[PDB]
Symmetry: D2
Subunit: 327 residues, 4 copies
């Protein structure tokens, strides 16, 4: 029995007896993700190189993927009439939606994750976290400052060899594969669970000289297992969306701890850490900063940064033990 | 003036006064690559999941992506009437084209590189190397056992966020972006040259306990710069075609030396090492095993393996200097 | 403000306070129409001609568009869990859906209209009429034997230079253009109304020798206007979906009266005449058999045929006057 | 063995021992046609309707489909470095290619045929005819004023339910189906031949009061067969490229004789009449004005018009016999 994202969301909406506003918001997301996917795959690039004549700004004067993606997400989410506040990785201030388009939801998103991998064509993506506004006050940024544990839905779209949307809600994590031939997301994995233990560690070891003792010790074990067991294999794509997705399906651990240049970690709490921590906990995994649960941090800034360790429970647990081992 | 790959190959053929056979071969390669990417992006997957019933098929043909890609290369190249010997990473023996479809070119190809990243949707691709048959004798595997220096043309197609085919021939390297909307590869970078020195090192550090001393000394040097400069960033996609392409565009160094499981390295010489080595040297870069030039190795086995270090000249020679410092 | 079919239908569902079942059925229709559109445009035809090898039944042994379209519609509508009875132009008996998939709606459809235009690649399409089952009896064919005037929704998808879906419901007719680049239907025409009078007559004059006096007289006027005004132009695509769509947007009249071979007309009441008569009346046009309203006929057979005259009100009215003129 | 249009043109070039210029011209024509169809199918229309905002553009460039198609043909042909004189149904004067991009071929083309069917989404297309410059003089419109019999190659691309390019050259006619999924035209019918006699007549009968006696006598003969056989079916799409293509595949007769508004017929000789006439004769069919062969007319005006009757030999000669019976 074929099941598309469209049918799945609509039905989950019926089972929860929703009024239909969130379902409309998710349908908008779906559409946004497809438009970004098409532009990311370079559809119609021939026009920029003068196939129809008029080869004007054939350099850098037209929308760069980062910006185009941010416009699609904002414009589409707005037009869903289900949001009131929006937080983008590409915007300094929270985006307060006009009253005539205002909804009860707050969305925190990363329109195009994997910044440094854009020019080399490595996998990139979009990340999103949705909150139900809780307060009778007028829309402001504080409405997006809720701890991740208050997330109603979170997930991401991966633009890789193929495009896949991973959606996580109260009752589980579901994976949908995009069939570009018909512009439809097909459910291929129902209520997914990450393996208890993996054999892959993911981190940028270029910061070796800045790692804290716990991280430094953990890495030593993956390369030189004290029990002489087989060493973990290493993998680091460079785009958080890509590295987290492999972690979800293959197992293992992903890491981005603090360092000199980034004392509180590089990844942002609102639209990078929380959505992935939610997807991970719902899949049966763990997401810690090393001292606490990511979903428990009470955000104080819109672009606040936080250190994160996520993946299989046994692999993450072992690293927490190291942290405690170091007082 | 916009330049399509079809326009480019044909003109390069005219400038070389060829009979048109090599032109027909490249055109067929262009067609094969488009087909493989369309399949990689999962076009038509809804059918596998029963969108039109469950009797459309008369057998159980769930062809795995790697097999399907290999089937496409084989049939498409053969229908070009320009080849006589084919070596695939997928077949134990060389494939000898039937007399009627026989041409004078030898093609060594890697159907879909990045096998471990197929299920997690990370970038994968196809790598190729073309040689002229140099023997009046009847075509056999021997004609495929030539040193990389004899290549007339080599390259690859990358199926990442977007699909790009990179082709290198005697007169230089050129990158073409596939425009999925019209099924056309567009020339977007001419006579490409790699940076003399980069700031990214690429290797699977999970084999740390099995690396030779030269590799170990170099890694520490990237993490702890003796001149005290900023340490190189680390990147390891897990797919050679992917990691090699970023090395070309961003500069830096890619490494896959020998280890316990692979005493002579893991990567294959004919359709992995050689093609990428030729692309690199043509871009003014380097590619060595650590003791000699990859393109100079005369193979004795079509599936022979070899250790490889490629990338920016200054980066590679620095490592080559560590090797020759020990021994 | 961008509006997609997905958002439009969902919203109309909210305004009517529906439970969500019909909305799910319409979403299924939308998906069906896209899959048919892709197969109609010949996506992936390269495989049938041996691009990946195995050129077996390269003649006539695989699904012909007529059949493939009928499978997609049936399978998709079934999987929507909103139907109980289905009437297809390609099936002799009414299709009674399994209890575990049963809904309250009855759908009458023409999966691929324009049979004779398939091989010459002329415009073809899909037509549909939806009824809300009215009776506590068990699902049977009689449930689809309701007069067109009981239609809850009707319309068609036109596979022409571009693909467009025309949807008609109680509050109007709306036209949606398909953007194949993202697999999304975009609303381009809101609540459309046909012009009071056109300048185009559409009919197969090859049956001249069989036309009744009224038709014969009417045609004389279009070619030789008694008042010496400019003559109407003639247009006959051959596919009902194509001819009716032009009629809706340009105005004029479309005709398929009785003849020798077809004493009661060739076009079928259930899935050709009623849906178009409904779309036409909702757009402000007329649909008569010459003696009565199409939407008023009480069907007695599932594949019953009926004569039809449709289009601008003034053009249709004038022909009715001729009929009365002839007692 | 699967045959792509790219493979076919190149090989036909090799067999003819050409320098490769005409091969490069045809390849460019292949590229242009793909681009036009992708635009015709409305790829990317969501952008026009603001899916990404309302500031993406820096001007008002709502290029109409016919203008865009003309822009593509002009720029793409010129970037082929194989032409010197271009005549478009869209430009009052011939376009003389700049000396640097000058080649020896003359191309007469119809950017998008079927203008009256553009808004109603009925089939439309592009028609072309190629000639060799036959004059050492400087290129001018005169080089485009040659009799149809001098064509080296002619054909058209049909954008109907699917896109098909038909190409006719000295050795016969061949049809290629565009596979939108890989952007490749597939050879699906070789050395095509029209039926000696069909059963469909195609003409706009809205000009009945302006037809000459021969045309009138023939129409009555199709409606009232003197031998009392079954009357021919009528078909008139309104787009020449469409009606002509069905005539080729199904056989029969197509007609557009002279009338009051068009004393010398409406259709243009250089890029409408001639190309279709050449395709027809090569398929063993006929094409006359009623008094002479279309391919024999020596034009004096690039936008000159001419009456035309084409199709199955027996059908056309029957009409040619009515003409020569009167006068
Ligand atoms: N499509 C849906 N999928 C899952 N939960 C939903 C859906 N629609 C509504 N809900 C739940 O019902 C709540 C209220 O929905 P709404 O009335 O649309 O704002 C949401 O916050 C969700 O917890
Ligand atoms: N399209 C082309 N691009 C570059 N070099 C070519 C091309 N076609 C032919 N050549 C060169 O000319 C030689 C002979 O070509 P051929 O007669 O086609 O086998 C090839 O081995 C190449 O060195
Ligand atoms: N999406 C919709 N668009 C228009 N009318 C609708 C929609 N959904 C429900 N309705 C109306 O409400 C009735 C009951 O809907 P349902 O409860 O889904 O069976 C339908 O028969 C329609 O008349
Ligand atoms: N691709 C081709 N298909 C058919 N005939 C061709 C082709 N290329 C060249 N010819 C023939 O050879 C002549 C000279 O070709 P060229 O040297 O390219 O101008 C043309 O005018 C055609 O008659
Ligand atoms: O080069 P670094 O420090 O590993 O940064 C990579 C990280 O940057 C990001 O692009 C965020 O800026 C993440 O997607 C990725 O995990
Ligand atoms: O898991 P490892 O040892 O890092 O191997 C990865 C390598 O394997 C390959 O898939 C070839 O087997 C390459 O594409 C990639 O570089
Ligand atoms: O050849 P005829 O008698 O005009 O039949 C054409 C009619 O047949 C149909 O294909 C239905 O069978 C209609 O779509 C079209 O109006
Ligand atoms: O409206 P009419 O007189 O039938 O003309 C239709 C003809 O006009 C054209 O659009 C050319 O002007 C042709 O494609 C078509 O055959
Ligand atoms: Zn990010
Ligand atoms: Zn490989
Ligand atoms: Zn029909
Ligand atoms: Zn025209």
């Amino acid at each position: 029995n074929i099941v598309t994202l469209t049918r799945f969301v609509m039905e989950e909406g019926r089972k929860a007896r929703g009024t239909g506003e969130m379902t409309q918001l998710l349908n908008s997301l779906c559409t946004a993700v497809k438009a970004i996917s098409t532009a990311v795959r370079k559809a119609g690039i021939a026009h920029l190189y003068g196939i129809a004549g008029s080869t004007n700004v054939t350099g850098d004067q037209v929308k760069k993927l980062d910006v185009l993606s941010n416009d699609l997400v904002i414009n589409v989410l707005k037009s869903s009439f289900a949001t009131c506040v929006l937080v983008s990785e590409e915007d300094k201030n929270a985006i307060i939606v006009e009253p005539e388009k205002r909804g009860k939801y707050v969305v925190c998103f990363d329109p195009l994750d994997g910044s440094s991998n854009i020019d080399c064509l490595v996998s990139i993506g979009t990340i999103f976290g949705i909150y139900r506004k809780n307060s009778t006050d007028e829309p402001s940024e504080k409405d997006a400052l809720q701890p991740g544990r208050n997330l109603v839905a979170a997930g991401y779209a991966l633009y890789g060899s193929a495009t896949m949307l991973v959606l996580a809600m109260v009752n589980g994590v579901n994976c949908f594969m995009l069939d570009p031939a018909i512009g439809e997301f097909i459910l291929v994995d129902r209520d997914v669970k990450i393996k208890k233990k993996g054999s892959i560690y993911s981190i940028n070891e270029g910061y070796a000289k800045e790692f804290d003792p716990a991280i430094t010790e953990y890495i030593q074990r993956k390369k030189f297992p004290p029990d002489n067991s087989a060493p973990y294999g290493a993998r680091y794509v460079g785009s958080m969306v890509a590295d987290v997705h492999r972690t979800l399906v293959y197992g293992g651990i992903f890491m981005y701890p603090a360092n000199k240049k980034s004392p509180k970690g590089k990844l942002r709490l609102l639209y990078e850490c929380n959505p992935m921590a939610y997807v991970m906990e719902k899949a049966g995994g763990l997401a810690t900063t090393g001292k606490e649960a990511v979903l428990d941090i009470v955000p104080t800034d819109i672009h606040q940064r936080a250190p994160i360790i996520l993946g299989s429970p046994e692999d993450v647990t072992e690293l927490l033990e190291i942290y405690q081992k170091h007082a």
